[PDB]
Amino acid sequence: QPIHWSYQINTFKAAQSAYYGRNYGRAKELAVGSEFLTYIVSQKELDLPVWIRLGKWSSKIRVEVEAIAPDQIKTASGVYVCNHPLNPLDCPANQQILLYNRVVMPPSSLFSQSQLQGDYWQIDRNTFLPQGFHYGATT
Amino acid sequence: TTLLQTLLIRTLSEQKDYILLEYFQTILPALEEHFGNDQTLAAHILNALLTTWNVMQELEFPLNDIERRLLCLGITLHDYIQEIINICLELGKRLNFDEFWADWRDYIAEISYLAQWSNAGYPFTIKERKLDHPLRHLLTFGDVAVHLSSPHDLVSSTMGDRLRDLLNRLGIEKRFVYHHLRDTTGILSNAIHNVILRTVQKLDWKPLLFFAQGVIYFAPQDTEIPERNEIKQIVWQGISQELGKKMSAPTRQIFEDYLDRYLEIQGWESDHQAFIQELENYVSKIWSLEMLLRQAFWSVPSGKFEDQQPIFIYLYPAYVYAPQVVEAIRELVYGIASVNLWDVRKHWVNNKMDLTSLKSLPWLNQLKYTKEDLPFLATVYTTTREKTDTDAWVKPAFLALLLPYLLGVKAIATRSMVPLYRSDQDFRESIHLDGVAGFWSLLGIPTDLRVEDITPALNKLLAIYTLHLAARSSPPKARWQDLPKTVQEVMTDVLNVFALAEQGLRREKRDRPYESEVTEYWQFAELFSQGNIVMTEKLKLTKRLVEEYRRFYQVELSKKPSTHAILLPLSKALEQILSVPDDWDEEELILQGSGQLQAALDRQEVYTRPIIKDKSVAYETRQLQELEAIQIFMTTCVRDLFGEMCKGDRAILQEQRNRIKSGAEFAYRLLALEAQQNQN
Amino acid sequence: MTEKLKLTKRLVEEYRRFYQVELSKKPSTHAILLPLSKALEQILSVPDDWDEEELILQGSGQLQAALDRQEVYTRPIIKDKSVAYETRQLQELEAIQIFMTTCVRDLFGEMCKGDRAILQEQRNRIKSGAEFAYRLLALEAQQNQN
Amino acid sequence: MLDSLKSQFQPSFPRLASGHYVHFLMLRHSQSFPVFQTDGVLNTTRTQAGLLEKTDQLSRLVMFKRKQTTPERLAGRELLRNLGLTSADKSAKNLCEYNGEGSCKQCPDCILYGFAIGDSGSERSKVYSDSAFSLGAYEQSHRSFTFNAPFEGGTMSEAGVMRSAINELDHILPEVTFPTVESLRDATYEGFIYVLGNLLRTKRYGAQESRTGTMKNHLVGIVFADGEIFSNLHLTQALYDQMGGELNKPISELCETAATVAQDLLNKEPVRKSELIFGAHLDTLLQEVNDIYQNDAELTKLLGSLYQQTQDYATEFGAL
Amino acid sequence: ILYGFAIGDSGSERSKVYSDSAFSLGAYEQSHRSFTFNAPFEGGTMSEAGVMRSAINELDHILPEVTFPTVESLRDATYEGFIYVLGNLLRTKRYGAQESRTGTMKNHLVGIVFADGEIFSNLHLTQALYDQMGGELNKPISELCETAATVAQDLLNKEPVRKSELIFGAHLDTLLQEVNDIYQNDAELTKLLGSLYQQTQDYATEFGAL
């Protein structure tokens, strides 16, 4: 989920290495002035790296990470609006999507917001994370 | 009128909406002064009023005409109980509520309650609280509705629960429905949107909010949703009939998939067995069609187009438009004047540099464009007939700052036919300017501006245009090819504002400034210095420096004197500092320079020396006042001009010598004008 | 040491110690800067091959033999009747030799780098500062005496 | 020194990546007026001024990954052609051209800096790197210079009409410093000497290399690690804060401070660090690697061995 | 071919002569002066009908005997191409604005170094030369050129570049004399630059714009 973002449109090209020359493109990049929020879920304690690289230019991200303690999660089931993004390909049985808004993207479109029926984790009073998602679970 | 009034008052009826016409006639022009200067509070309040008005218009019995006036005032105060009854009294007379109706202060008990229970000692004016039921539920409808950011923001329970249950409490019996289009593309997206509008309008859906990517509609509760397979072939027939009429006086196949990829009407059936196919497909001719629509309907050239220097300004909404304001922006984009900076200067140098004057100029050429498409992506475009870039950019850069200041819209100015598409926090700047001529980067004005910065930018841009057109221009031919040199000298050292003034005088074949221009060019120096201390200090010092020598030397400007005369003590202070060996101290330079000033004054005729010329006072004290008036000036020139500002370096004083001398001549004329006025 | 700059007040007070005129007499610039005009004339006039220590005795003798060409009203050492005349002269000739050595070393040698071309271009400017410094010092004495 | 470091490197290029990073910490100093441009203006971004929770924002020049990696890359290809390990002639068996279908699949450049032809092969860059940032603010750090171009006859007019050649350009100033980390993964000893070669041997960057853009790459440390260390931005924000913004200090004091901030940072990030070459261990590494790059016989042996390692990788694991 | 082209159809060519901005060895304050310029009317005065003439400004000029250290660099030349570029460096004499009146300079070539790639920066040679004198820069031009030859050799020994040939001192003032013997002889010079013409024309039709 994008918390703060900015875009730069910067051109890039292929080089004239030879002394004689006779293509090029514009990249709308997300800029250094930006911060995004994600959540990882695991069965076990995880040594997550404090630096990662993304995208066309192997671009550095600072990851600052906190474990959500059992004093602030709760488990429940019913109907909930997920304010986070979600990938519909990873949606299991025992979750169903009632309503959704999408962001169209290769390799697959995401939901940017959805109403679901199924089990969830109230990790704070204003976000709900779908329980039991795993890579390709619809497929 | 302001441009925003001028556009809005065309959208309203001849009759039975007149109270909203009294708002545009009287409250609006005061509003955009106080709230006008992300989102702007003037555009929030305007959309808030219109959205409350448009629900009030649907209400199944009409509320009484006394309540309508209080709805309009309360929604105007609401972002700013005895601790509030005074703050509506203080603000309401400043916002000209007395021109809307003088009675408004009588209703202050209700007007303060609508803008935030007790009676508080102020008994209610309203006929019964049977009117306070619909009134508060109307007022709270617009206030929620104008903080939506996308057509989907009605489907999330986060704001949609209250927007439904307020509609339920108002008893409207009409449901929210949407269309949304996730890719926006010049004329083609505007055509797609307006074919959805005309197609759903035959189902008696009526639009309630407009967004950059879609519409929300009030609709019947017993309505069939239009079927996916019908609106797809209709919007193909739609674009095909408009290009059809142009030709008369693959492209379906890629387009039918383009709607199924990017269009949604609320409640069309989908399964997530579709996103399996979207991944399987992963394991354009559209923008060429959109360009063909620009050639057809904007009348831009085929195959030769960069040589017309086409710059496009794209006017996105701030967040939400009400139905009346998208109609107002229709009257803009088809009716905008081809701007001439020659009268824009004249109406801003007149009116004493207040950019709020710019609101009043004739920016256009009771709606006349009702057959034209509603502008979801409102683009305006320039053409110029000299062939250079700075000449291409001067009008777009001005328009791209101006239109956000007049209308609260968000601008991108670009050579690019594809825009940045705006959305709820892409909106975090008001303006972008993609690749302006280097006069922009030289001024150091940002290429991206937040809404608070737009009036600083308009001030610097008009101050440099109104300074370039004075010198390095000719009356029929503005010579914007020289604008980068006019900017580079003004930015290097602020006294160059007076160096440019003097160039103007020489072109004009005039030896002396008018009395008006002596303050005008000072307000430009005082304007360009605003953020920089070292320039502000130099401008304060240059006035003080002459205000000190004007204690002991005064050539009367009526006798039409030379610059040599006006500057006799400054020219002898500088010529002594610069000519003397670089080894000698400041505290010796002051004595030899005050000696030379004393020797020079004794060579002038007596009437030029204010301290000696009054024989009313004894000679030994006239001498003491002359020696201390010379000494304090010589101490300012050697300490503050040479020592402090010019860092004690003779190269840095020698390059500034002539800019100081021009600035001091304008300062002497400003002090003389100030004396001959304030002596009354 | 600092004496490469900031000379001018000491240069004038060192002749004000042996020669004066009151500004109440409304005097000429030529009567105010008289000692310095004789000192600078001597430095610039005599052949340029002569170095510092011969100039001082000549320039002092040009100034003692020129203040005795004027009224005792202008000599606030020879005018002090409290002292025997040979001891007035012992004070007079040590004031002149101390001023005139500051004109040959400090002014000409240090401040003008010992170059007659540098001294010549800035002679009028040096003189002007001594006229003003003389007036500035004259306006101190009436302050300390009241 | 280098004879002990031969212990750290891999013996031949592996198929799958490993987690053996050798990191080069550098200060790139402008020497003459570089032009880090796209779209006709000098590249900048807004950033926090330094790491201690500042309210204070600062627009600093950005030298993009492209703008620094390609001048290093092309200066490696030139050396390989000087040695006769690759050639420019189309009829030779060792042709390489910089990007196209005729790009090689075996030469040291193609394996260390990568290629993508398509179905005919692709290879990931082993030199990882970041966009570099100016230590100071943009407003302190650039100037715009006029440029004109008359007729050879000394004159802006020909046939009495003016030539349209006058324009501004924006130029970086001759002492502004760009802290950088360049990082090399899973390399052989000879691959490390080739890449460290490029870092020290190349000297011109940005636009207009024919007339401008000379830079001095002062290497400040080498750090062997189990993963990647800090970003360029994080090194620049640490260095600005260690100076408190008092930026007008001589280049060698700025290099000596850059070593102390680097060691202060490396202690805080959780990757294990095999070696830390700084100070007098770096200044002996630099002289003994300069002595390879000044000797005809040892460099022709050493880069020839890189060739074999990379030709062997090409036939065993690469695109054949 | 050697200095490049980029206007119009048929592509663009990178200059094989590589050049840089050069810096004064001394500070700006010791190294320039401002002069005033007038332009009176031909009747010999600055007024033409009693109307004054607005033609008095001042311009700053670099003093004589101030030195600008440089390395200019030539990539992939033939031997005649080297003689052409070296010819330009010895045969040119004017540099600044107002060539018609000003800006004569004396280029002393202090070394020629054959290398696989670029040696130290222009700023770096200047800062090395300033340090070698400690800023005592008021030295005669021969003592200054002989010092520049020695600081240049110190710096070359810290560069990661194979150096094939280093022409300095007695080998350079022989080479400069052998080049003066070309540029004073019409037959040698017409032969030598005619040959370059062919080489550059051959290059044009085989790899360049033809």
Side-chain angles (χ1 to χ4, degrees), chain E residues 110-127:
Chain E
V110 70
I112 299 178
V113 183
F114 286 67
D116 50 16
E118 50 272 49
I119 65 173
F120 39 79
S121 87
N122 291 260
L123 184 56
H124 195 89
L125 179 66
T126 305
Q127 287 178 331

Side-chain angles (χ1 to χ4, degrees), chain A residues 79-136:
Chain A
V79 178
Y80 62 98
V81 288
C82 182
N83 289 337
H84 212 239
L86 194 58
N87 179 29
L89 299 176
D90 303 334
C91 171
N94 311 91
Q95 296 279 6
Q96 71 166 348
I97 312 297
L98 303 189
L99 301 175
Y100 63 85
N101 171 25
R102 75 183 194 237
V103 51
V104 281
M105 284 200 74
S108 173
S109 307
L110 308 174
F111 306 151
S112 183
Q113 177 269 5
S114 175
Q115 181 179 34
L116 295 95
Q117 183 181 11
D119 45 344
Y120 61 90
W121 290 299
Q122 185 96 68
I123 64 176
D124 68 60
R125 310 298 74 177
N126 294 43
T127 198
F128 303 82
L129 282 197
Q131 180 163 351
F133 272 53
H134 61 97
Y135 301 101

Side-chain angles (χ1 to χ4, degrees), chain D residues 1 5 13 32 34-35 38 43 45 97 107 128 176 178 191 195 202 212 228:
Chain D
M1 296 297 103
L5 311 179
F13 288 101
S32 168
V35 182
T38 58
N43 290 129
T45 183
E97 67 162 27
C107 69
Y128 284 18
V176 315
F178 289 87
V195 175
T202 212
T212 212
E228 76 167 308

